[PDB]
Design a protein around this nucleic acid. Structure first.
Lengths: 104, 132, 61, 384
RNA sequence: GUGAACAGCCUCUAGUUGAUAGAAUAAUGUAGAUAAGGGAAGUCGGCAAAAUAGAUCCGUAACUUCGGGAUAAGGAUUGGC
RNA sequence: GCAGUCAAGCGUUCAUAGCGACAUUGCUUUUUGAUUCUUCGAUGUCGGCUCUUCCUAUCAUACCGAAGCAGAAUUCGGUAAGCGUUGGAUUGUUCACCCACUAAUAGGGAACGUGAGCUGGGUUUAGACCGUCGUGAGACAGGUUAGUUUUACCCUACUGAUGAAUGUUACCGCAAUAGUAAUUGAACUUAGUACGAGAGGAACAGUUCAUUCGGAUAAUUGGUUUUUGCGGCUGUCUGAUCAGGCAUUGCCGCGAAGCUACCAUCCGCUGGAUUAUGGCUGAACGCCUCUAAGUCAGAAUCCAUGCUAGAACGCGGUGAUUUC
């Protein structure tokens, strides 16, 4: 999946319009699983953590366990890891400052 | 996953509520797409006798509802041409539900099943009591 | 090549002619043309239609 | 702005302009490649399409699902009278193309070909080919110089033939004239073939054989001035449109400020010249036979003319060709049949067929009997 | 006359037969239509059309200012002699 | 937005297989600003529906190169715009966002394409309620409701249709030039084979069908009915019976002929020259090298074969040519 952020703000984008900031712990993990495209269908959750790999490479790896249901009475937990390519663009709020119409 | 089938006329567009042939608890199936259909501007994809579709339950057991699962058309009311010559058509549409591999959840099928559906799917021909 | 008889009245059906109808209780009905195929849907009784062979067999024509 | 939804184009651009053809007889643009090791024969033929009927054959195609199974299939019957040769014509080659050199006509010509040369036959003194026929009337030195002109020069040789219209239930009395190229060998031998066939008939079965892939060339059925929806298959506008909905909305952008040549627009529909390829011959029937409609699996004596004849055409009491699938051009139309330009192999050309049954019920609507000999056995004794 | 009826449809007494006409039956319009299978997937939106309908008998819920809702919903029947 | 160069941190030990921040040199007009040059004796100012064509900075498809490429699955780069790029819930939406199919759901331009082509939901007249502000009229680009979309017959353009003049007139042909079209996917087989420690797991040739598109066509099946063709029925009118009028085609069943539909069937060709890359011989440089001189193989590309039109100022071959 894809995450958009600003190179002048350093602030992550929630897909509708919002701009929840980045802590990479306990609040950035919350926005990042709504984009996970998994559905609430069969996980409900199990556990989630991320991998360190690199600061300047634009890829964030998360691994997660699901605890879903397969047969009529079989609860079952499996795990896997997802790699998010992180795409850089502008904050329109903070690209406005280059236009001298800053105050409003 | 689908074998070769001679082309027959398309009679079930998206949104058609067809009957449910088996005894797996459902009563009707709501076709939302067709596996292996094409692409054209403003053209609705359509199903035929023997196609694999995605279909939801609108009426039946409360376990089966509110999720999408694949299904197989077994009867059809729009007339199609067989190669031997006769134009035939059933009385109402019908569909049985299956896994994406093609195995059938049902135990038995009531009513008749189209012959070109029976040759295309092996597990349908096991559950079929009457083949045309 | 088999020539089937009309289910409604009496007519011979050569290959590639007329329609076929499978009723929901798995019974096969053959029709020679749209005349007897439309009179079948009106729940008309072919023993009382005069031009059928099923009538002329009954009243000894 | 861009297009916001990609969609493929309406219509085909290689078939422009849709204008009326110059004549009802469509020209053969290209004849097949000559092979001079083989003997002399014709390469195309002329005929008149009559109608369609249904056929049943046992399909023999391995690896299919309908193997050794009866299939019903649609065929056309083109009425094909024997065609008689009246002249030959030889072409020399230039850097600017092929140029006609000399046409040599035969001595006697029928009344059917003379109709073609006149627009008002009954007022005419019928003077066509009177001074030409005096050349044969003497010792004939005026013509032996002309064929020897073609033997020396003249790379390719065509042969002027014409149909026999009196052996055909049309009301027209005028014959149709056409060129046909020969593909024999050693063009001093091609002209000696046509020399011996002046005022001689050419049958149909010598040219074509059964199970052979041929083409069909004719002029399409016409329809007159038709609108942009049924001409190109474009989309109808919604219901709420002021002043028309069976149109095309945007002719084009601002720039270029000209209507482009590619947009869809109403005009003539039909009566075009079309070449259709790869039609397979099923049956080459002779005229002097009561068993045109018979089959080895049927064994009933009947002709292929249905009960009450073909609609708008009449009686096929001649030679005919029965070929698979539709042919461009309607009934009564002059239709050229050409050999295939390339050798075909794949699976479908080499297949041999034997019929099960020919449909001879009445085409004039909802016919239920095949021959009137067995209509009387079903209904029995009537009043009349 | 039909019918609950001065509704609609047809005739009697009385009036008019005027509204530029002839010939062909392309496109696109205007007005009136019918359509296989699916049935709002169309669209800003069921816009437009379609279905329902007259009578007699059965049966009629929530809610309520107790009057209503109510032709609620829903289901049969209708000629001729 | 986008592309170079330089290559910090990384890729368990390895600067460049592959991610790549920061510095530095540029391009583009698909953003946002700056400006005031054109138009205020009016260029109809958002989005959608419809339709053509162009661009390549390539998502798919064809043929290749590189890898930390065993297979399978991928990832990076080259030639290349021939061809394809969808169906839906919510919103006036552009934008977004999920659901499902698919080979793939790539980005863009043409007066931010297209209103004498449409629709009028939005915006931006007058009516009206609310909330904050105002003493008050009133303000709000805050929220919500109701609100007329005019003309083409002219000229060019395009699509079709005739036509004077070349001695008259008829027939049969040649081809300058312009257009050009087919596209993709599954299944079996090759084979549980190559490969693999296994788990897993291919491809070329062959066969059969299908998607999208195109040309036709009416045997068959379905649709349409003013054949008012035959039959049925209601109300009235010709005294009844027959046979008919009227009900702006009275309605209902059936209904040939015509037109017609992936709602029906049929058909859609093979040769040459090249790009990307792989090779041969072989110097420059006694070696080595696909390149310098020469040369072989090679893509959905280019040109032909084929297909459509036939220059109304392109042309050829033949028939007859007005005593009377």
């Amino acid at each position: 999946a894809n995450i958009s952020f600003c190179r002048n703000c350093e602030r992550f984008l929630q897909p509708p319009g919002q701009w929840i900031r980045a802590e990479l712990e306990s609040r950035e993990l919350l926005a990042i699983c709504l984009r996970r495209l998994k559905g609430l269908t069969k996980v409900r959750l199990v556990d989630a953590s991320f991998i360190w790999t690199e600061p300047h490479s634009r890829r964030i790896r998360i691994k997660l366990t699901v605890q879903g249901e397969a047969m009529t009475n079989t609860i079952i937990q499996q795990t896997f890891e997802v790699e998010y390519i992180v795409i850089a663009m502008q904050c329109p709020d903070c690209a406005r400052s280059y236009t001298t119409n800053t105050w409003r | 996953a689908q074998g070769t089938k001679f082309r027959i006329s398309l009679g079930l567009p998206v949104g058609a509520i067809m009957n449910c042939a088996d005894n797996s608890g459902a009563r009707n199936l709501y076709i939302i797409a067709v596996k292996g259909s094409g692409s054209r501007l403003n053209r609705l994809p359509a199903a035929s006798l023997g196609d694999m579709v995605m279909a939801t339950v609108k009426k039946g057991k409360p376990e089966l509802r509110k999720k999408v699962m694949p299904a197989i058309v077994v009867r059809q009311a729009k007339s199609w041409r067989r190669r031997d010559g006769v134009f035939l058509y059933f009385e109402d549409n019908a569909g049985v539900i299956a896994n994406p591999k093609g195995e059938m959840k049902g135990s038995a099928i009531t009513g008749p099943v189209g012959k070109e559906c029976a040759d295309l799917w092996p597990r349908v021909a096991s559950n079929s009591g009457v083949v045309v | 090549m088999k020539v089937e008889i009309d289910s409604f009245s009496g007519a011979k059906i050569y290959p590639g002619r007329g329609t076929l109808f499978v009723r929901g209780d798995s019974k096969i009905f053959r029709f020679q043309n749209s005349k007897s195929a439309s009179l079948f849907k009106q729940r008309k009784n072919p023993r009382r239609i005069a031009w059928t062979v099923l009538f002329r067999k009954h009243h000894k024509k | 702005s861009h297009r916001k939804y990609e969609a493929p184009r309406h219509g085909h651009l290689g078939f422009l302009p849709r204008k009326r053809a110059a004549s009802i007889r469509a020209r053969v643009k290209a004849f097949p490649k000559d092979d001079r090791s083989k003997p002399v024969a014709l390469t195309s033929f002329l005929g008149y399409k009559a109608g369609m009927t249904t056929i049943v054959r046992d399909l023999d195609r391995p690896g299919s699902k309908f193997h050794k199974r009866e299939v019903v299939e649609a065929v056309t019957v083109v009425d094909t009278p024997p065609v008689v040769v009246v002249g030959v014509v030889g072409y020399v080659e230039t850097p600017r193309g092929l140029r006609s050199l000399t046409t040599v006509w035969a001595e006697h010509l029928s009344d059917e070909v003379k109709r073609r040369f006149y627009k008002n036959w009954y007022k005419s003194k019928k003077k066509a080919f009177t001074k030409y026929s005096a050349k044969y009337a003497q010792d004939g030195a005026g013509i032996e110089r002309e064929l020897a002109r073609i033997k020396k020069y003249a790379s390719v040789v065509r042969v002027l033939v014409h149909t026999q219209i009196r052996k055909t239930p049309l009301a027209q009395k005028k014959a149709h004239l056409a060129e046909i190229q020969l593909n024999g060998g050693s063009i001093s031998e091609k002209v000696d073939w046509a020399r011996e066939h002046f005022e001689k008939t050419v049958a149909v079965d010598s040219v074509f054989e059964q199970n052979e892939m041929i083409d069909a060339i004719a002029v399409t059925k016409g329809h007159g001035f038709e609108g942009v929806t049924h001409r190109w298959g474009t989309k109808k506008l919604p219901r709420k449109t002021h002043r028309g909905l069976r149109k095309v909305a945007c002719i084009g952008a601002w720039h270029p400020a000209h209507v482009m040549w590619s947009v869809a627009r109403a005009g003539q529909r039909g009566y075009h010249s079309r070449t259709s390829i790869n039609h397979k011959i099923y049956r080459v029937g002779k005229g002097d036979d009561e068993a045109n409609g018979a089959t080895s699996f049927d064994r009933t004596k009947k002709t292929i003319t249905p009960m009450g004849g073909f609609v708008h055409y009449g009686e096929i009491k001649n030679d005919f060709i029965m070929v698979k699938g539709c042919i461009p051009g309607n009934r009564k139309r002059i239709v050229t049949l050409r050999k295939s330009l390339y050798t075909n192999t794949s699976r479908k050309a080499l297949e041999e067929v034997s019929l099960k049954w020919i449909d001879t019920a009445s085409k004039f609507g909802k016919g239920r009997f095949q021959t009137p000999a067995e209509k009387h056995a079903f209904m029995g004794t009537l009043k009349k």
